[PDB]
């Protein structure tokens, strides 16, 4: 899968936003891909890094982070105040067919839209 | 919200299977809320756990999928291999609702992109 521009649609709290993010090469040291949004400033852009390892079991890792900028008085250049992180990892094995991996991926993707998760994340209230 | 029966649709490689799972109590030691599927055998069980923390708020979600194979020269089945998953969110104290919702929706939508399905289903580097 060669890197290319990715356009996600129908996102946000109200479901009307969207973002376009384009590749930014691969790091030869650890073989991690990268993507970012063209935000006109290198330090205030959302970025995504995805990498899959090799064996004695495979491991896929996805990281998402995006900063928030605030222009405090007494200065001109914006800085970063807080950041929101994310992390996803998979631990499939050698003798696993693609059916099980696809099932796990679809289960995780559809579990992030159920009322339980959208209530436990947006409002940060523990489930009981 | 309190735990309740959760049904998932359009699950699977071809988008035709269906997974229904029901609550399985709350652990009082560390406050993880479990879920499980009525598979008639406790060992061959697909389980999901979700828990949030209190102070840098932390949200964790774990998915576990065991595979059952009929052991040779035995009656009861045994687990051979297992597939894991994990999600971790690390919002801060002053983070508003919109930022968290944006992160969650971005993670949900990005996981259906051709890049991720190629990287997971076929396990080939990008």
């Amino acid at each position: 899968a060669k890197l290319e521009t990715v356009t996600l649609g129908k996102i946000g709290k109200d479901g009307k936003q969207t973002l376009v993010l384009n590749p930014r090469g691969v790091n030869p040291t650890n073989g991690v891909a990268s993507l970012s949004q063209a935000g006109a400033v290198p330090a205030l852009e959302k970025r995504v890094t995805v990498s899959v390892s090799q064996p004695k079991n495979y491991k896929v890792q996805v990281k998402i982070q995006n900063p928030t900028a605030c222009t405090a008085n007494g200065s001109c250049d914006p800085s970063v105040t807080r950041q929101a992180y994310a992390d996803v990892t998979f631990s499939f094995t050698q003798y696993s067919t693609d059916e099980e991996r696809a099932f796990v991926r679809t289960e995780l993707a559809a579990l992030l839209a159920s009322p339980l998760l959208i209530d436990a994340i947006d409002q940060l209230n523990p489930a009981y | 919200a309190k735990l309740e029966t959760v049904t998932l649709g359009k699950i699977g490689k071809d988008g035709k299977q269906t997974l229904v799972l029901n609550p399985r109590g709350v652990n009082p030691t560390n406050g993880v809320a479990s879920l499980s599927q009525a598979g008639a055998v406790p060992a061959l069980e697909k389980r999901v756990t979700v828990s949030v923390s209190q102070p840098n708020y932390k949200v964790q979600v774990k998915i576990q999928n065991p595979t059952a194979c009929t052991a040779n020269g035995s009656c009861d089945p045994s687990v051979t291999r297992q597939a894991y998953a994990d999600v971790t969110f690390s919002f801060t104290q002053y983070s508003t609702d919109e930022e968290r919702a944006f992160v969650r929706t971005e993670l949900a939508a990005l996981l259906a992109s051709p890049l991720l399905i190629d990287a997971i289903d076929q396990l080939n580097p990008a």
Partner: antibody
Amino acid sequence: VQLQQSGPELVKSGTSVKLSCKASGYSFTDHSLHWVKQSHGESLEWIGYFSPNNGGTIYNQKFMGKATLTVDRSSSTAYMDLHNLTSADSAVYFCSTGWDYGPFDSWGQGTTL
Amino acid sequence: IVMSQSPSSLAVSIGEKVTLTCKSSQSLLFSSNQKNYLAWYQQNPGQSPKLLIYWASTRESGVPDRFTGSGSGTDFTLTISSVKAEDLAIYYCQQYFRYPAFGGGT
């Protein structure tokens, strides 16, 4: 958010006119302010938009000659200019806003010419 | 991008399950995930129009359930569960990626 335009206008021959859109209740950080027009009766046409995250100087084809979009950030007022008036000064012009690539959320009433 | 539509006028009066069809000159599967970029507007003859459906299948908040939209790769349609007292006036369709472009009438 709600926005309203500023008054019908009546111009003669070919001169310059001032059309302004008063927007109150939202920030220009990510939204794009469009300038769709309807002409008269049937059909409607696009003109352009101003978005700080995409350049803010995008115009519809064959309209660069008779359009100019400027925005004052302090007063949160966006006003656009016309240069020649032969058939452009025909009927109502609209003012719209929305997300970066999403649909047009809310419109205000349009001034007639 | 020309956005052709149904003929200019219809003559449905009441109770009829009238449907409106539209055609596009280029596939609208712009997003990486399979999401369409159409939206349906209705405009009363007096004032500015309103938004009804976006993403070609999602109803906007504050709209009666009688409206329903379905979409495909390049052939979209809009079906209303019978026409009520106030469901008249012109209906428009729009695509909102790159260069937006309206087109058509009732």
